[PDB]
Design an enzyme around this catalytic site. Sequence first.
Site, PDB file in Angstrom:
ATOM      1  N   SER A   1       0.776  -1.253   0.000  1.00  0.00           N
ATOM      2  CA  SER A   1       0.000   0.000   0.000  1.00  0.00           C
ATOM      3  C   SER A   1       0.815   1.316   0.000  1.00  0.00           C
ATOM      4  O   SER A   1       0.257   2.375  -0.302  1.00  0.00           O
ATOM      5  CB  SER A   1      -1.076   0.009   1.102  1.00  0.00           C
ATOM      6  OG  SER A   1      -2.185  -0.822   0.740  1.00  0.00           O
TER       7      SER A   1
ATOM      8  N   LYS B   1       0.441   3.761  -3.048  1.00  0.00           N
ATOM      9  CA  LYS B   1      -0.702   4.690  -3.175  1.00  0.00           C
ATOM     10  C   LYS B   1      -0.300   6.165  -3.021  1.00  0.00           C
ATOM     11  O   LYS B   1      -0.979   7.049  -3.536  1.00  0.00           O
ATOM     12  CB  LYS B   1      -1.789   4.278  -2.185  1.00  0.00           C
ATOM     13  CG  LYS B   1      -2.424   2.927  -2.560  1.00  0.00           C
ATOM     14  CD  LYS B   1      -3.124   2.287  -1.375  1.00  0.00           C
ATOM     15  CE  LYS B   1      -3.702   0.904  -1.803  1.00  0.00           C
ATOM     16  NZ  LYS B   1      -4.268   0.134  -0.638  1.00  0.00           N
TER      17      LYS B   1
ATOM     18  N   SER C   1      -6.423   3.064   3.077  1.00  0.00           N
ATOM     19  CA  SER C   1      -5.823   1.954   2.311  1.00  0.00           C
ATOM     20  C   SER C   1      -6.895   1.237   1.449  1.00  0.00           C
ATOM     21  O   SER C   1      -6.827   0.034   1.202  1.00  0.00           O
ATOM     22  CB  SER C   1      -5.091   0.982   3.269  1.00  0.00           C
ATOM     23  OG  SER C   1      -3.824   0.579   2.761  1.00  0.00           O
TER      24      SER C   1
ATOM     25  N   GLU D   1      -4.283  -3.910  -7.506  1.00  0.00           N
ATOM     26  CA  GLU D   1      -4.715  -4.470  -6.214  1.00  0.00           C
ATOM     27  C   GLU D   1      -5.628  -5.660  -6.484  1.00  0.00           C
ATOM     28  O   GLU D   1      -6.511  -5.541  -7.324  1.00  0.00           O
ATOM     29  CB  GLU D   1      -5.482  -3.430  -5.363  1.00  0.00           C
ATOM     30  CG  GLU D   1      -4.622  -2.294  -4.772  1.00  0.00           C
ATOM     31  CD  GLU D   1      -3.669  -2.752  -3.664  1.00  0.00           C
ATOM     32  OE1 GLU D   1      -2.920  -1.889  -3.132  1.00  0.00           O
ATOM     33  OE2 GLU D   1      -3.672  -3.950  -3.302  1.00  0.00           O
TER      34      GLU D   1
ATOM     35  N   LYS E   1       2.260   6.528   5.417  1.00  0.00           N
ATOM     36  CA  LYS E   1       1.446   5.475   4.802  1.00  0.00           C
ATOM     37  C   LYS E   1       2.109   4.115   5.034  1.00  0.00           C
ATOM     38  O   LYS E   1       3.320   3.954   4.839  1.00  0.00           O
ATOM     39  CB  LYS E   1       1.250   5.696   3.310  1.00  0.00           C
ATOM     40  CG  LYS E   1       0.370   4.596   2.665  1.00  0.00           C
ATOM     41  CD  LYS E   1      -1.071   4.669   3.182  1.00  0.00           C
ATOM     42  CE  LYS E   1      -1.913   3.486   2.671  1.00  0.00           C
ATOM     43  NZ  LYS E   1      -1.809   2.297   3.569  1.00  0.00           N
ATOM     44  N   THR E   2       1.303   3.122   5.463  1.00  0.00           N
ATOM     45  CA  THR E   2       1.803   1.775   5.749  1.00  0.00           C
ATOM     46  C   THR E   2       1.386   0.804   4.640  1.00  0.00           C
ATOM     47  O   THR E   2       0.570   1.143   3.775  1.00  0.00           O
ATOM     48  CB  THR E   2       1.326   1.201   7.111  1.00  0.00           C
ATOM     49  OG1 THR E   2      -0.116   1.191   7.146  1.00  0.00           O
ATOM     50  CG2 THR E   2       1.853   2.041   8.251  1.00  0.00           C
ATOM     51  N   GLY E   3       2.032  -0.356   4.627  1.00  0.00           N
ATOM     52  CA  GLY E   3       1.667  -1.441   3.705  1.00  0.00           C
ATOM     53  C   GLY E   3       1.898  -2.775   4.389  1.00  0.00           C
ATOM     54  O   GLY E   3       2.687  -2.872   5.336  1.00  0.00           O
ATOM     55  N   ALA E   4       1.218  -3.808   3.896  1.00  0.00           N
ATOM     56  CA  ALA E   4       1.392  -5.162   4.388  1.00  0.00           C
ATOM     57  C   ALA E   4       1.193  -6.086   3.192  1.00  0.00           C
ATOM     58  O   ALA E   4       0.394  -5.781   2.290  1.00  0.00           O
ATOM     59  CB  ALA E   4       0.358  -5.467   5.472  1.00  0.00           C
TER      60      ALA E   4
END
Length: 265
Positions: free
Chosen positions: A45, A48, A105, A141, A209-212
């Site tokens: 993410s 983005k 997200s 996505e 901003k985070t992502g996994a």
Amino acid sequence: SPQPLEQIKLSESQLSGRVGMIEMDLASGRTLTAWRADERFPMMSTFKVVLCGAVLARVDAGDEQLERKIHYRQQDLVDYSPVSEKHLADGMTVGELCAAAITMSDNSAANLLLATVGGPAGLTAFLRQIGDNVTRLDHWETELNEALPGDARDTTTPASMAATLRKLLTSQRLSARSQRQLLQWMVDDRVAGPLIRSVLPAGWFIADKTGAGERGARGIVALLGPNNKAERIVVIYLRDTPASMAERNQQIAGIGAALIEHWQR
């Protein structure tokens, strides 16, 4: 905490995974702390932000408006669409979509936006146009989160992501209003922002901003600084660890803590 490098080493050892990090001066671009800064990690993410960078460049060129309403169908939705699923009837503005993608997200929002920039290929072309010759998007996505071992697709490096975030946020590339908007969307993150803010010492700016992803893939791109000021870009990625989400979160937090405790450089 241990020194930033000592801590990062410790996280790899405890996680049995690979960590990538860069801490960069926002104003000058000076690299302050680095670890595997040239190795590849899934963006997840975190992409983005670059996505909405490209959207804003279109707004700046007059080829797009944040106010333009996009209308879509339920069959278009992908896994995890907290905002977009609520607007099958009325639709969403481009600006609302960027807000949902970055602050919540929202994955379908990201896909609707990606279409407007010419898809994964179009976003990659944008990156090369602002002098990122490394970061690449290949999937939509949610396939972009697969984190297949050794896969160069859908990846960035810490050094390239920090450079690119700096380019979007402080260089002549986006209009002043667009630069301020991209930051505010990061300021407004609902996923990890309030949590982080709650454990940071008083006086510290955060935007993020985070992502996994799969196989332990986890990350954050952040602006951070004392005296209430966005002073440094921090990029942290993890990959190829079997560890729980909680422990991956804790390790990234520990790395942050080491940076904050040992800030003066």
